[PDB]
Symmetry: C3
Amino acid sequence: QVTLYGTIKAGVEVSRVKDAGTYKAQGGKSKTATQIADFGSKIGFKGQEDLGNGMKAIWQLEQKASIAGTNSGWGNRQSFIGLKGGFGTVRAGNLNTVLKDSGDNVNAWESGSNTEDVLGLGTIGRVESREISVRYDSPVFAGFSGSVQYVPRDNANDVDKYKHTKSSRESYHAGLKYENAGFFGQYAGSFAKYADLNTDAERVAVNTANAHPVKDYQVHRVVAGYDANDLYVSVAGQYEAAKNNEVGSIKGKKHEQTQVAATAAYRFGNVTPRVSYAHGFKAKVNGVKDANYQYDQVIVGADYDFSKRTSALVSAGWLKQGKGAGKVEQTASMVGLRHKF
Amino acid sequence: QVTLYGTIKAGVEVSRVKDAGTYKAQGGKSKTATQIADFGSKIGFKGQEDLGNGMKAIWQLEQKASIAGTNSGWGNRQSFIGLKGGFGTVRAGNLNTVLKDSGDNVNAWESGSNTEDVLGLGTIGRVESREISVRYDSPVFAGFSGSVQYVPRDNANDVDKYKHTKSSRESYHAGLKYENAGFFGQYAGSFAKYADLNTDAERVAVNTANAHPVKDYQVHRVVAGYDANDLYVSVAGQYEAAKNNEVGSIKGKKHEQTQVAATAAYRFGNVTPRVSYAHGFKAKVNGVKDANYQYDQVIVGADYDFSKRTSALVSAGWLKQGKGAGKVEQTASMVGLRHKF
Amino acid sequence: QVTLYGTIKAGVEVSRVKDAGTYKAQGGKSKTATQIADFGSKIGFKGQEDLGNGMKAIWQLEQKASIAGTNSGWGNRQSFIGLKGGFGTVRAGNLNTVLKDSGDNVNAWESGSNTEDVLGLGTIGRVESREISVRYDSPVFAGFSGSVQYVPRDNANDVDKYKHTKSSRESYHAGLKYENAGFFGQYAGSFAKYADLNTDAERVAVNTANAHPVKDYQVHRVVAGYDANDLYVSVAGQYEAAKNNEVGSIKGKKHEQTQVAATAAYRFGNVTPRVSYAHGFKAKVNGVKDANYQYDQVIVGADYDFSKRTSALVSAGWLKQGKGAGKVEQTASMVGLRHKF
Ligand SMILES: [Cs+]
Ligand SMILES: [Cs+]
Ligand SMILES: [Cs+]
Ligand SMILES: [Cs+]
Ligand SMILES: [Cs+]
Ligand SMILES: [Cs+]
Ligand SMILES: [Cs+]
Ligand SMILES: [Cs+]
Ligand SMILES: [Cs+]
């Protein structure tokens, strides 16, 4: 067996930044931008074959396909080959991280890439990625399931394959999930003995310009809520910590940040109003409080479901980053359309 | 619903340039080149869903796929999401321009990209493009239909989104079409308060190397003819005008050019002989006649239709550019094969 | 008609190099690398239409799609348009070379690109490629078939289309095959009046950095064996020769190399153990023996066929390159999974 699927989705966004530092216009305000933007249209191919003994072969090839025609590549969304049966599921390839998957219960919004941080809970998602990796998923059993996932050294750093001179950027991802009668709890997280962050605290490839080597990199996410009877509510807590691993005065000093997010939605027939709130507390950077990494955000909107495949979408969002005169405030709103095939 | 389609098409071309300026060989003639060339093979995916109230969701993702394996990208031909119903059709994405669509009644030929100007009426098509835009199409009503289409500022110039420092390259596209009993007339055109041309008078992105900012950029196309009873004839008139908007001695001075084209074809069973003629009159460039932009061309050929999907193609073309010792003459011929799926 | 197909395939490889020159660690050994690697996953689209008179239209578009998400492009595997009927088959596009096709009887192994030379008989395949070309295939007749294939000048060197100043890199490919009662013999080969090699003796584009222009470039391959009754055995001989065509002291001097390979496999139900051996004798380079181009390799492994579409794969390989203190030794092993759709 073999099937074609995808989502086409897009809309118009309207945004404004308030940033004293970069916009000399009055009160530090940018002008208002108005863009047709693709929201992450995608196309895939996938299939499975019964292997005779309760085992199945599974594979998938999913690609970014933006109707603005700005993508190229195959396999640059989750793509894999694997086996599934009574044991659970094993998969190898460009895999979502346990934490990328858990993000479905945290960030429900659609936006173009420009507005990810204001029209969506982009900041809490900064820890989410796809990795050439292997992943095991369970058995859902007595309402419990789990995943375990690993990125080898020589996949995390190809260059260094044969000379093991940079320390390993191999990493571990794992989660545990419980569902009962509409109630869900999940823990998802990751660990990397050595990694590298950019200044927005995203993981980037070893040897990226302005990469900051870190050590004992760890992320934890707990999510809980209720998804049943027209009602959805979700609350997430996230904690990130690493040690400075750059050679310099500050090696060994402690990085950390705490983020929380909350979403509520109610389904009124075909209309689903949604509200979200997120906050990042002050980061400790090199052992010292850094309020540049603090933020607050609220998003409100709704989906109109024409069909089970097709929705109209509207949202607006209000985001505040940092403290004082370093302050950045983003405002945005959009209207859009989504169609799943 | 969801469907796969495409055209595979290709052939061998044979071409020669006569250009004193660049070819020192006798009488200013290049040698004769002989190439297997893809004619613009393409592949798409598209679909629609009835939404209940005479409304439909529509989407499409079409890509260049050249069997020479030189393309990459998704969505780099017309791709969109939209709604269709009694109101007409609304669409947003990488859209053909009203003028790109009207080009189906002007330039019927197939050629590789190298021969577009000699094996096809490439020059009159220089005004045709795809744009991240929104488009409304009518209702065909009493034989009349029309389209209206817009490219926002912040899609025409992303860089400048928030600092509105370069003037808008937002643009408007529109057309009106009438069909009666084989007879067709159409007006298609466009307007851009500010734009940027290259020296072959194609629109290019703001801030392209050797881009020439222009103002009040306008194109008009009227096409008329007859498409019925084995007989096809088309006559087109095109007019382009803009003001110099480059800072320098010549700002405010007037650009313009007039082009005409004519095609006739007759269907003799499975064979369709075709003849085309096109002419560009002298351009006024910076208020002054410039005969470098004058050209004449004739193309003759035929299609052999094996099936409704599959054709053999042959053509030859004879093109003259400019006047005097700046003169460029292109000669070409091809044989090819086209298959629609 | 129109069909979708592909192969997804991938695994974990483990490799080690022993190279005194580049690895200062003890006894000239690299460390051991361990990688999830795609084995050349691919996806295609193809179809055919009966044209009425025993003739068919045929086309194909095949792309590299690696589930590690590192490819982009359409048409970058064999892709074409063509006609098929009582005359044989004619095709134009990104075609496999007669010698690339013959490689199916020589190199049966799957490996990621990093291990092609140790987990697969990569070296003998150095002469195999895809080319924008035309190809004729026969009629299988009294057990005999054949192919003839040509790459025009102006496809081998686009740049030089109109100025015929570099000599032609046009080339000819041809083969002859016989099958009788499990027994097969094939000759495949190629000739290019002028070409360009890199130092691993692969053909590269004219004007590639460190390309070495050659003249009278010729390759010959004879393969023979037995493919029936659970038993497969293949023996190949390959010979490559060219003259130095670089301007310098050594123009006109003779390049050549001889390679042989052997494979045996036996099918035990669903398990197919396989063993392969290959050897490259000393190259003559500029008229002089060069033992850097000598190598020996053995690969052993097996396929486990879950289904006709789906296999588990394991192999190990042991490769030795050159003589003496220039010596390079590669060791590798892998486990993998393949699924055809
Ligand atoms: Cs998103
Ligand atoms: Cs992310
Ligand atoms: Cs990654
Ligand atoms: Cs064309
Ligand atoms: Cs064009
Ligand atoms: Cs464009
Ligand atoms: Cs291979
Ligand atoms: Cs090869
Ligand atoms: Cs090639």
